[model samples]
Target: MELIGDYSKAFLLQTVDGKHQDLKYISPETMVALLTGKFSNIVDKFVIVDCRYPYEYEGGHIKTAVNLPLERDAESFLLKSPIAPKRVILIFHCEFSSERGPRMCRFIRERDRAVNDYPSLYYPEMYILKGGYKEFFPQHPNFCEPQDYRPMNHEAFKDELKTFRLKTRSW
Candidate 1:
C-alpha cells in the first residue's frame, strides 16, 4: 500500500471534490443520487463515460452512457466529438473507487502532472461513480462481480490455456 506523505488535507479533499474537472473524485452519496433517479438528466445533455472495457460495457452501463474503454486513450474521444465540453461528465469504474476511473480523471484534470490539468473538458465538473457501477445500479450491487467481467477472445485456439479478459481479472 502506498501512503501519500506530502499531500495536505486540502489537496486530498480537492481530489475528493467533484466540483472541478481535473480531479473529479466522488463520494458514495453523490454517486447514488446520480444513479437512483435522484439526478436524472437527458442523455443528450450529460454523459457518463464508462472506463471499463468493452465486455464490462456490453454487460451493462449507466442507462444511456457511452463506452470509453480505459485501455484506449479517452482524450481523443472526448475532445474530437461534436460533443462540447460544457456537457456534464461522469466516470464509472467498478471495484473500490480507485483504479481506472480515477487514473483517467486525474489524467484529464492534471494533464501530465498528476496534480491538476488546465485544458480539460470545459468547466470539467468531475465525478467518479463511487462504489463504481455497483454503487449506482441497484439491480447489481456486487463490485467484485461487476469488476470481474471480461470478454472471450475468439482468436484463442481450442487448446490454448490463456483467457481473454480485462487486465483487472483474477485467475
Candidate 2:
C-alpha cells in the first residue's frame, strides 16, 4: 500500500492543531529507553496503542497496550478513554509501520483540526512506532509475554522455520 502525501516536518506542522504540533516517529530503541523510565527527567507517562485488529491484538501485544482496532471508530474510542488528555503521550503501532498506525495519526490530526481550527488548541504528543510492533517485538520479546501474538499473512507460511527444519531433517 502507498503512504499518503508527504510525511515531512512541514506537512505535519501545517496539520497540527496547536502552535506546536509534535507528531513524530519514535524508534523502538528510543521507545524502550522511555518505557524503562530513562527519560523520566523529560517524559512522565505514555500509552502504547495497538492499532491492529482485535484477533491480532488478542494473540499478543506490548505489555499495558490497549487495543483499538483500525477498522473501528478509533477517534471516538480514544476520546472517550481516560488517556484522551494532552498530558499523556500517545504511541501508536500496527503489525508493521504501515497503513493503520500512520493513518490513525493523520486521522487524529485532522479530527483535532476540525475541532480547534485556530492556533489555540491542545493535542496529545502523538508518535508512530518507526517499524511498528513487528520490529518492536523481536528486540523486546519479554514485553510481549504470554500473549505475544502475530497475525498470519496470507502470502506467508505460519511456521516457515519449523517447516524448513522438518523438511531438511529426513526421518
Off by over 4 Å in 1: 1-44, 71-73, 85-87, 96-98, 111-123, 139-171
Task: Tell how far residue 37 is off in model 2, in angstroms.
Answer: 1.4
Q: In candidate 2, list every pair of residues with a backbone clash.
A: 60-147, 60-149
Report lDDT per candidate.
0.47, 0.59
TM-score of model 2 vs. true structure: 0.65
The digit string of per-residue lDDT tens for model 1 on 1-171 reads 121222211211123534334444666555445555554443224456777656556665655566775433566565534254213444545443336676666655543233335332342454566556655566344422343333223243322213223343232
Q: Distance from true position, residue 165, model 2, in Å?
A: 34
What does candidate 2's lDDT look like per residue over 20-43, in tens digits?
134467677777776787757655
* The 10-residue segment with the lowest total lDDT in model 2: 11-20
TM per candidate comes to: 0.51, 0.65
